[PDB]
């Protein structure tokens, strides 16, 4: 369970976090846009404030071009 390049290349995602997301089935940038903050809870090192900023950035790229 590996991440895609559009997720690995998103600012603020380190390689560790990328692989932690892919472990939960969040493997691409478009998958990250579809999450709620609650879906990312209890990720070592990931605050709720950063979870929200990452999901917003994924939507800006994938949904709003």
């Amino acid at each position: 369970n590996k991440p895609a390049d559009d997720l690995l290349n998103l600012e603020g995602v380190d390689r560790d976090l990328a692989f932690k997301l892919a472990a939960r089935g969040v493997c691409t940038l478009e998958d990250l846009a579809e999450q709620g903050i609650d879906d990312l809870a209890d990720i070592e090192g990931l605050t709720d404030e950063k979870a929200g900023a990452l999901i917003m950035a994924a939507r800006n790229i994938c949904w709003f071009g």
Partner: protein, 259 residues
Amino acid sequence: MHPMLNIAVRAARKAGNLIAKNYETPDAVEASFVTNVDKAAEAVIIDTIRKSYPQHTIITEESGELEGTDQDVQWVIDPLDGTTNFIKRLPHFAVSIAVRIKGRTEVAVVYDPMRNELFTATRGQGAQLNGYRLRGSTARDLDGTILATGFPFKAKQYATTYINIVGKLFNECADFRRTGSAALDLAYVAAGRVDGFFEIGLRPWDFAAGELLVREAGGIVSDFTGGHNYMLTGNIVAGNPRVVKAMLANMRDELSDAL
């Protein structure tokens, strides 16, 4: 089985009983009034909560923030969602109760006392209607969809923006529903009775319970820009991820002109 859920249900059903008894009394047209039904329902709910959890904070529209010594737990209450419907004896209205712990919503109840429909959810455990598990709408885009909504009657400086948003969505969706209860609109998104919901300028007690029903039935909830600031702005979009994405994309150009 969550104990707090048990108490939230108990309070909602006691308030609903009282509302339904006042629904049977003569309305303003027939009479051609001293009992605030919202306030009497509010009192029943606060009494039921405090008899089990006297330390907790309670927040409602009629009373504002009643601070408790345990500020880590808040009950967020609409004692009667759908006041105009009740006044005209249109029998679509609800009691809404949400419990938030350390800033996260953990328990939700929306209770329709005229149909005896109890919508419940707890965080990480799913959502139910009268015991049956809810899974939301299967729509993959807006083709053929029914969107619930409300008009900005409390904020008419936004009337033109809102009418423009409705008109553009209507070229993609099939129809709309305007019921008069945001709490039940969100419950109906969770049940798949409508395919999504949007409204401007709601207050936290309007949607605090309904938004957890949606998310526990597979949906997402966002603000009108796609962010997570809806608890602060009260501009709500809700539905499954494909429906929400399509709604936000459709609306975006009009929002830019407004700002």
